[PDB]
Scaffold this active site. Structure first.
Site, PDB file in Angstrom:
ATOM      1  N   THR C   1      13.169  -1.318  41.408  1.00 17.61           N
ATOM      2  CA  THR C   1      11.855  -1.468  40.702  1.00 17.61           C
ATOM      3  C   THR C   1      12.047  -1.631  39.203  1.00 17.61           C
ATOM      4  O   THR C   1      12.943  -1.034  38.624  1.00 17.61           O
ATOM      5  CB  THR C   1      10.993  -0.229  40.954  1.00 17.61           C
ATOM      6  OG1 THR C   1      10.824  -0.078  42.355  1.00 17.61           O
ATOM      7  CG2 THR C   1       9.605  -0.371  40.397  1.00 17.61           C
ATOM      8  N   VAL C  30       4.517  -0.830  52.038  1.00 20.23           N
ATOM      9  CA  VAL C  30       4.106  -1.035  50.645  1.00 20.23           C
ATOM     10  C   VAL C  30       4.232   0.316  49.955  1.00 20.23           C
ATOM     11  O   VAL C  30       3.730   1.319  50.450  1.00 20.23           O
ATOM     12  CB  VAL C  30       2.659  -1.581  50.578  1.00 20.23           C
ATOM     13  CG1 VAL C  30       2.192  -1.786  49.165  1.00 20.23           C
ATOM     14  CG2 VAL C  30       2.550  -2.881  51.367  1.00 20.23           C
ATOM     15  N   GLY C  31       4.932   0.324  48.835  1.00 21.20           N
ATOM     16  CA  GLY C  31       5.077   1.495  47.994  1.00 21.20           C
ATOM     17  C   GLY C  31       4.054   1.510  46.887  1.00 21.20           C
ATOM     18  O   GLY C  31       3.032   0.857  46.966  1.00 21.20           O
ATOM     19  N   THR C  52       8.447   4.444  38.731  1.00 22.91           N
ATOM     20  CA  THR C  52       9.555   4.148  39.641  1.00 22.91           C
ATOM     21  C   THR C  52      10.020   5.443  40.283  1.00 22.91           C
ATOM     22  O   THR C  52       9.974   6.489  39.670  1.00 22.91           O
ATOM     23  CB  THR C  52      10.713   3.410  38.893  1.00 22.91           C
ATOM     24  OG1 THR C  52      11.923   3.488  39.654  1.00 22.91           O
ATOM     25  CG2 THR C  52      11.025   4.074  37.561  1.00 22.91           C
ATOM     26  N   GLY C  55       8.172   6.107  46.223  1.00 32.46           N
ATOM     27  CA  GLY C  55       6.881   5.482  46.062  1.00 32.46           C
ATOM     28  C   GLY C  55       5.758   6.203  46.755  1.00 32.46           C
ATOM     29  O   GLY C  55       4.681   6.327  46.185  1.00 32.46           O
TER      30      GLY C  55
HETATM   31  N1  LIG Z   1       8.726   3.188  43.590  1.00 33.67           N
HETATM   32  C1  LIG Z   1       9.370   2.044  44.359  1.00 33.67           C
HETATM   33  C2  LIG Z   1      10.878   2.256  44.581  1.00 33.67           C
HETATM   34  C3  LIG Z   1      11.637   2.509  43.309  1.00 33.67           C
HETATM   35  O1  LIG Z   1      11.024   2.554  42.218  1.00 33.67           O
HETATM   36  O2  LIG Z   1      12.874   2.674  43.321  1.00 33.67           O
HETATM   37  C4  LIG Z   1       8.773   1.920  45.735  1.00 33.67           C
HETATM   38  O3  LIG Z   1       8.464   2.971  46.283  1.00 33.67           O
HETATM   39  O4  LIG Z   1       8.680   0.796  46.222  1.00 33.67           O
END
Ligand SMILES: N[C@@H](CC(=O)O)C(=O)O
Ligand SMILES: N[C@@H](CC(=O)O)C(=O)O
Ligand SMILES: N[C@@H](CC(=O)O)C(=O)O
Ligand SMILES: N[C@@H](CC(=O)O)C(=O)O
Ligand SMILES: N[C@@H](CC(=O)O)C(=O)O
Ligand SMILES: [Ca+2]
Ligand SMILES: [Ca+2]
Ligand SMILES: [Ca+2]
Ligand SMILES: [Ca+2]
Ligand SMILES: [Ca+2]
Ligand SMILES: [Cl-]
Ligand code: NA
Ligand code: NA
EC number: 3.4.19.5
Lengths: 160, 135, 135, 156
Positions: C1, C30-31, C52, C55
């Site tokens: 991300t 979906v995050g 980030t 998620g």
């Molecule tokens: N927050 C992102 C993953 C990440 O930031 O590493 C998601 O859940 O898609």
């Protein structure tokens, strides 16, 4: 506080002057039967989560309301459904969006919550996840109603 | 769009929302209904909320969570938070619709800024109330 | 991300987030990244935020909007709101990660509770700072 | 004005014992170049909205980061990309999710904000919308890297 349920079947330009009592009573009767089902479940000690799931399942089943059977139409004359459920105790939630082959999106949302490490699933991914956990593959045509097709057409006509 | 909120005998809150979306939407369009904090939210420490209306505005305003935050951080009652969101903020942003909400104390609210909202509520063991229009 | 937040010379805030998600995710997952109020939020009255981490937890906590509401409703500074969300609330739910955020007065914060977060920042006309690990 | 930019390229993917100095330098170089670009844009009077769009587009393009080129793999060895952009001045927002045929998800998200009546679009409908607005269709092959493939195998 005392156990309690509220439900809705949608907000908008519901016009009193265009409605008849007979039309209104169909909506009133549907709302009252579903809320009473929820009240009775509450009284019997069912969980808030099961109560809101069942109320929303019944509203999905009822062709009067824009969810499940009775869904509105997209620009392309198809149906794409969304749902969410959230448990205030654990703050766990589940949701699906853009699904066309699941009869009861609220039940698929419950599956995402309880049987996946995820909160939201979309599209064919969501469908395939739900299929493997007991939801049958329906045709999107099952959601279609004359009522909502006419509304699409009337909305198109205003657009012109 | 349809939805339900409840407080059970154990003191737990929950919310659910389901919809076909908006008539004539572009294929692939996702509204507020499946998004946590926009169309649906529940937290035992505050409120359970389910929304309906112009979904794009409810996303941008995070309407369901905003009810919770106004109570949690703004010091508002359920009735005050509902009025602020539905009767003031949402219209000011060009959105219409309503929501249903129940707080941890068992207060219930069904605000809407449209001509109507199909709705019902009832305490366990009591007669329900149903409605379509304002008042 | 990945993400970015900015305050421009006109005083406007904006945020953006993009991702491939989490390795080995179920197709269809979906995050928080594309969800307004979860992984991305901006409001001139408060803050621009990009998130980030895990998620699912950022959705359940509406992390980005929570920063905003803690500041706008609760009166907290950007640093206080970041500490509460990233160092207290997110870990209590099993969540790990961080965020970047700029408030309307040009304060910047890059909180994270993980071993690292790839990050950089800089005022227009100044030298930028980058980081990977804690500092 | 008191203009400023911050960027990130992810938290939680990092560990000092599993990384090399050369890898660390490459990340520092990328972050420094992208944040510099953002600063210079701000200095020149570009909008915050254009700055965050361009910074994220650059992070997408850089294979070191899990967005666009260099995206992680799903369980099925595919890529499904998500993005969001939001304007604090108007609260306008645009987002896409589950897209595999758009090179720069953040540009598609900006298209949704600016050239649709919607806030969020997913999957093939989001792609078709974008294609109709002049955006190019790519093979999801272009996102794939050995770094992320090897990470997929480690998660197994
Ligand atoms: N927050 C992102 C993953 C990440 O930031 O590493 C998601 O859940 O898609
Ligand atoms: N369980 C029900 C509904 C469904 O699967 O969607 C059936 O199998 O008929
Ligand atoms: N809020 C729903 C539509 C509605 O409630 O009428 C949506 O945007 O999908
Ligand atoms: N929520 C705060 C302040 C208020 O309600 O006015 C309290 O209950 O103490
Ligand atoms: N939170 C509710 C009740 C309370 O504060 O005691 C209110 O502010 O009105
Ligand atoms: Ca119970
Ligand atoms: Ca059957
Ligand atoms: Ca008990
Ligand atoms: Ca009060
Ligand atoms: Ca209070
Ligand atoms: Cl070296
Ligand atoms: Na229905
Ligand atoms: Na990249």
């Amino acid at each position: 506080g005392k156990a309690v349920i509220a439900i809705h079947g949608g907000a908008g330009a519901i016009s009193r002057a265009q409605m008849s009592l007979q039309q209104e009573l169909r909506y009133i009767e549907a709302l009252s039967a579903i809320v009473e089902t929820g009240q009775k479940m509450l009284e019997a000690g069912e969980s808030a989560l099961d109560v809101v799931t069942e109320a929303v399942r019944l509203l999905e089943e009822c062709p009067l309301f824009n969810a499940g059977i009775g869904a509105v139409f997209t620009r392309d004359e198809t149906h794409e459904l969304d749902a969410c459920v959230m448990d205030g105790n654990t703050l766990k939630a589940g949701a699906v969006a853009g699904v066309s082959h699941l009869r009861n999106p609220v039940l698929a949302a419950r599956l995402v919550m309880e049987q996946s490490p995820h909160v939201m699933m979309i599209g064919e991914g969501a469908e395939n996840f739900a299929f493997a956990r007991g939801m049958e593959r329906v045709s999107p045509e099952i959601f279609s109603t004359s009522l909502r097709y006419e509304q699409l057409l009337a909305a198109r006509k205003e657009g012109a | 769009t349809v939805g339900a909120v409840a407080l059970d005998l154990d003191g737990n809150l929950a919310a659910a929302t389901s919809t076909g979306g908006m008539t004539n939407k572009l294929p692939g369009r996702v509204g507020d209904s499946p998004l946590v904090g926009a169309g649906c939210y529940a937290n035992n420490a505050s409120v359970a909320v389910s929304c309906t209306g112009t979904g794009e505005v409810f996303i941008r305003a995070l309407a369901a969570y905003d009810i919770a935050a106004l109570m949690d951080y703004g010091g508002l009652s359920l009735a005050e938070a509902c009025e602020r969101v539905v009767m003031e903020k949402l219209p000011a942003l060009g959105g219409s619709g309503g929501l249903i909400a129940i707080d941890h104390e068992g207060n219930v609210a069904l605000p809407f800024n449209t001509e109507g909202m199909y709705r019902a509520w009832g305490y366990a063991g009591d007669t329900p109330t149903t409605g379509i229009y304002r008042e």
